[PDB]
Symmetry: D2
Subunit: 452 residues, 4 copies
């Protein structure tokens, strides 16, 4: 298999797209930007319904970290299908969900005692985090960051702050969430270069919380938790300053506020550590994961300090949680991660950094490149001084990449994420970065952007 | 396989219960009443880790309608694993999710224009229903029923009204839900026998909404939707009067309010119709489904009147929704239902009615029996005039059933649900009803309850 | 002065109504039913701008309990104007507000430790009650009664449940209020005659809270307070069963819930006791008062169990609270009440009961009469079996009373309140009851209602 | 009369303070900082219960703009007491409330058609503004500013953002308020000198709303209104840049958002214009006033664009609104304001500016002086570079002033407000500024602050 695209979308793809629009809700599908109609997957390739072959740099939005169709994950699922599928893990018991809980407790950040709540999704894992934090603290308010994405349910919509259309006509959602700026080193209310001056940006965000919220309208003692992504995903793959979370933990500990680390997109080895927060040297009270954990089977998990447990039965539960097929898949994923795929993320990190910095020196349309392991963001701007979003150009680059056999996703208002499966070879990665660069070159030339 | 239980919980069972308590969150697991530790499943039998064989009357909380390990569902899953598992359903397209959407549109109650939103669970499907209703009506309030169960997320916790421990320290959840009594023919605020006098009970519930809420404190024009279960599940397998939903639809239509039918537990053929609402002769605006739809794989669906669609992209979505493994499982489940299992539930209905009415005549501890198809509730009371809940005895009946090779689940404060897989044979059904009867007889003898 | 009305509204009255519509907000003013345009007041008489003289049975919505222009109140005001008007009650100190606080502590129902918070209105006094209850219990939910009226601010609009137009487009107000039926002996969801069967109605209301709310969706331990009117005012002058509050206090005490008695309309001697709650033999934790307390000057008070006090400075306050003019007026009002006016309301009670029961025997249009002291409600129905509201006829009776020199106010959907100043003589009371009776007779004749 | 203080608090004052603490709620009284116990008032002097005579620079928190005991206001009240006090302005009509509404409409900012809602307080006037804005726009969200004070009721507590103790244990209040930084030229998150660089500060605040709220988590189309003080009162007498409100109005008009101008503290001539907003050249949709309007009698008013009126009766009302005694007082206040007191504010403005800038040059403890007309703020800091709040020193200066016969109030964390009655003479004003300067000198010398 190699990148190989003729007409896209081809005739079979256009039929599926039309039927999708007829039968399915209007969501985030884009027939104009994301006309990829997947029939099968093999290693790091999609094969579309018209037989187009595309190298994958999206991992299906950071889910297929272990490969699009990993054989160790498939064999574990098949073995589990021969035994049992659903055992009602929240009314009855089974050993499968317990084996996964023990492993998640073992791989959690830091050396503190943990327990686990299993669910079906990242939004469920984050709703469970809200409940655990309210029950255990008996406090009801939360702080979250502008640009954050935590899910689309009534509790998590209040945490989420990436695009206002996510909230359209939904007010009221769960009351009690206040938002402050993320320490985004490229874009922040202070105009601070957070790469050159990380401490000044860290200090402005901490001071915003302490001086602007705590000293005026948010009683610090009534805040149950601070929700954060360790790198903002949907908000643009924004990597905050290395010392930010240590300072945030000082502020949280002073007031008895929990730290809730959303790893739904950046966990399961994406950043060359099991948990992205491992790069920032703090131990969060709660960690949420989903997506990649199940290697293609829906699963969520909420990993928490053991003393935060619900003190009485019946406060929280679900039906499908501890699904035995998801559990089997997840144990296989974690084994693949610990035995080679995380090391692969570490090995390819310098290739991404080197190639994306080379691209930033050459192509004026690139405002910023940022990343860790195999999580990279490239943000496009109309002018490097104004940092005006190049939204149209960003969309055109995604389309020019797809026409050349590379599947990319947008993030934020004018960025692209590069998140190839962790099984990707050095050669496959170079092939993708080459296609990406050709897409940037074409859209630059079209619009008269400087090429140096 | 036949029912065959020695020591339960056995040594291997005791060790998994101990480990589950150590690593997992406190949810609804009961070491004293639900010590069933499942290792595998065959036909309608659970095989525990100690080799105990139990006839299943639980369907794993109404998920395993097509059987505990259905070969056609498993074949569809293994075939889909050879193609692709996750294809980012909401960013990219795939024909598997569209084929499920087309089938769900077709099988929806009534014959009106429908679209479908796919998710990962019942609570997600109900959260999607709230969002669709708010967006489409531009109204924010909802009416739900006392005794309701709709899920445990911030939106659905406001709808749910079954046990207050479900809400412990969770306030505030989503604002704008008002609750009114369900037309529970055995227990209601008017003391109406709603079996003998269904119309009186219907009129009291409708009059409570119209006179008590609309004429005083709930502006009818600001209500987006009335959420209901066509039979209350977690609240006790409570079957409302046949004409109730026709009267509720007349009220809703007068004020432009949506009817939202939660079929998460009672749908997918459980009542001898594809949808339980079919017994009530109305066409709901929104239908929510999960559990049995995925035949053991996590899936949810929200089927809605097509003109309610979200006008704009990005108001709702998810990562896992449209999961191709869950879509293949669901198409296989629906084919199994339509090719004999729904007819089997209709055929077995009169056996359940006859045997449970015989048990009510004989065992004074039985206050009420009720059901449709293969959904039955038996409620236990200390006295038939006071209807004081026999909660202790209810748990003992479940325990004795287990000791005799029958897996049962409690519902409400003192009821048991009988929900065997729809593939159960007449002989397997008679065997489980005989075991149920022995468990009632044993606990009646033990406590001095009359046996007539 | 005697009742003496020619053309009403006269020319000067019509011009003020026109100007009011031009410059003022649309509130509850009625040009067709309440065309009384007051220029001055003397004793128990209103003198309109056209020189029409009307006997007052309105007390200006229960504010003018001590008379429309009480000389002792006016002398206290003029004396205070020679000293100081406003002294910033909550930043600086002044002896006038403290002397009122000491008197309110003394006259509070029962003999427990009390403190007082002073404000400017009923709605402010009830908002203060919510804050005191939330702070002191650290609980956030409240129970209120259908038909309640507690004010029109964001906190009190959640408590109020009288007319839905009070809440039109206001959602969301303060979250956490749940409503249950009032023990209205004439109209309740059980169809109980609560005059003949008070205990049955009490038990249905208590059982609705305990079984329907506490056992299903309202955690009893999270409820700060139950708000009630001892007689519902705006909701129809509805007098509950004598033993109701004793039963409500037993329920509240079992769960550590505060009882909050709203005396804004029924206090300051209106029922022939200083507080209406005195007829029910309980001691509320919080009592709210306004209206008659200031004898025509804006004032509110929240009298509370002293250990509920705010622990820290700055949780609540206001600018105008403790206003020295309002404090002088209030001390004068209380002295007038204690020196004969409360005794006068007790003396006139049997005259009102006798004459209204005679009117009920004679005029079929009267569905119900009810009252205590000088607080009476008369509810008009189209038919005594259906109890359909006679809303049109109710308004016509008010209009005909006005044409004959009696000022009346509607309450609820089809009732009239009789609330004459407490200084009214037996002869003035007989005169107003005779006019009321003629207005009922005229509107009965006009519409063909039976007269027995 | 002249400043004349012996012992303060003296023996009569200490008795009142002790009784206040025994009988009254814990609010914002300070026996340590504000031991002023007022017995009477004469011109611009308080006379305390021990006969101490103090020049007033507090106007009783900006209420006594027309003098502590104005004879024209007292004569109008007395004349009204001879006619009627309360006429139930929201059920019946009277000419007195209508005369005040017409005048308020005439003196409103700009030349647009207005209507008026009368209430009893500033918090009531602002709750009415919330209701008018929700009803008329059918939108439910609001923006307010950090440092803002709009009142302590459930709706206005959500708008208020000055001290967190104001909200302690009150969550949830009315949902839907988001807060952004005020363009405070001395203290802001950007470190901008808003005196030297006003446009840069204006632009940061506008960009915070547009880029940080509108482009991320607040749908601009769902915002009913932006609440602002034209000068923040309780937050420190912060005067924003002259062009800020013009830019805010551009943003509001683009999105159909109302501008709500809270003049409760800065209106009724305080700033040398009837309305403080008149200095900033915009016409707000709604203006709220209270305090000073009634010259010592409780009153509130909400003045709004006439097309925002409630389209149906019964949405909003009160009992005491249109109180005839308050209305008489208010017309007298406005006549005094238009015929000499506003001109006096204009005449004394340069004296305050000159004396306070002289004090800032001499006393290093002064960080900032700011003001308009007879509204002045002086902020004290421990160091002019850190701007660390000198809270203790600020309290000591208030006490040293009181000991020398000047009544001052604190504002913000370390500021003092100078708000003498608008009748103050040039000589009286110089006497006050001299005492203030002596208090600053004493506290400077005590703590070793530089005197230049
Ligand atoms: C950071 C983050 N949180 C939460 C979610 C929600 O996960 P899901 O879409 O599986 O509900 C996503 C995706 C995510 O990236
Ligand atoms: C009626 C009903 N609604 C919602 C749910 C929630 O489903 P899940 O546990 O899959 O989230 C259940 C279970 C249910 O029975
Ligand atoms: C029982 C009750 N509560 C509250 C209020 C509100 O009073 P106000 O109109 O003075 O705000 C009224 C009137 C009332 O009758
Ligand atoms: C700006 C502002 N808004 C509102 C209020 C509240 O007014 P009151 O204390 O009369 O309720 C005050 C005082 C104020 O200064």
């Amino acid at each position: 298999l190699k990148p190989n695209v003729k007409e896209i979308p081809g005739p079979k793809a256009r039929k599926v797209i039309e039927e999708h629009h007829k039968y399915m809700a209007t969501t985030t599908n884009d027939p104009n930007e994301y006309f990829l109609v997947i029939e099968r997957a093999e290693g790091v390739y999609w094969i579309d319904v018209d037989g187009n072959v595309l190298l994958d740099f999206s991992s299906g939005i950071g889910v297929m970290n272990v490969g699009l169709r990993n054989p160790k994950v498939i064999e574990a699922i098949k073995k589990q299908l021969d035994l049992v599928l659903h055992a009602a893990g929240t009314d009855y018991y089974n050993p499968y969900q317990v084996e996964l809980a023990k492993k998640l407790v073992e791989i959690a950040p830091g050396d503190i005692e943990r327990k686990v709540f299993l669910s079906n999704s990242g939004t469920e894992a984050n709703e469970a985090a809200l409940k655990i934090a309210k029950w255990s603290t008996n406090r009801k308010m939360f702080i979250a960051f502008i640009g954050a994405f935590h899910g689309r349910t009534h509790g998590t919509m209040s945490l989420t702050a990436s695009k206002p259309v996510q909230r359209s006509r939904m007010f009221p959602t769960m009351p009690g969430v206040v938002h402050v700026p993320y320490p985004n080193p490229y874009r922040n209310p202070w105009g601070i270069d957070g790469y050159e001056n990380p401490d000044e940006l860290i200090n402005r965000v901490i001071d915003y919380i302490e001086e602007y919220l705590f000293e005026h309208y948010v009683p610090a003692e009534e805040v149950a938790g601070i929700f954060f992504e360790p790198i903002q995903g949907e908000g643009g793959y924004v990597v905050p300053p290395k010392n930010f979370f240590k300072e945030l933990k000082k502020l949280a500990d002073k007031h008895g506020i929990l730290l809730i680390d959303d790893e739904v997109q950046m966990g399961m080895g994406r950043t060359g550590r099991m948990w992205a927060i491992e790069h920032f040297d703090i131990v969060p009270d709660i960690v949420t994961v989903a997506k990649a954990l199940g290697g293609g089977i829906p699963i969520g998990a909420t990993i928490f300090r053991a003393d935060l447990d619900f003190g009485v039965s019946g406060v929280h539960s679900n039906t499908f949680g501890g699904n035995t097929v998801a559990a089997a898949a997840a144990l296989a994923v974690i084994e693949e991660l610990q035995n080679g795929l995380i090391e692969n993320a570490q090995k390819l990190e310098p290739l991404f950094r080197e190639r994306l910095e080379e691209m930033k020196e050459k192509y004026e349309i690139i405002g910023d490149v940022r990343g860790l392991g195999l999580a990279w963001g490239v943000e496009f701007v109309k002018d490097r001084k104004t940092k005006e979003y190049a939204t149209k150009e960003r969309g055109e680059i995604v389309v020019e990449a797809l026409k050349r056999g590379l599947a990319l996703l947008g993030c934020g208002k004018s960025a692209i994420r590069l998140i190839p499966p962790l099984i990707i070879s050095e050669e496959e990665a170079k092939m993708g970065l080459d296609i990406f660069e050709e897409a940037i070159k074409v859209v630059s030339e079209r619009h008269g952007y400087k090429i140096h």
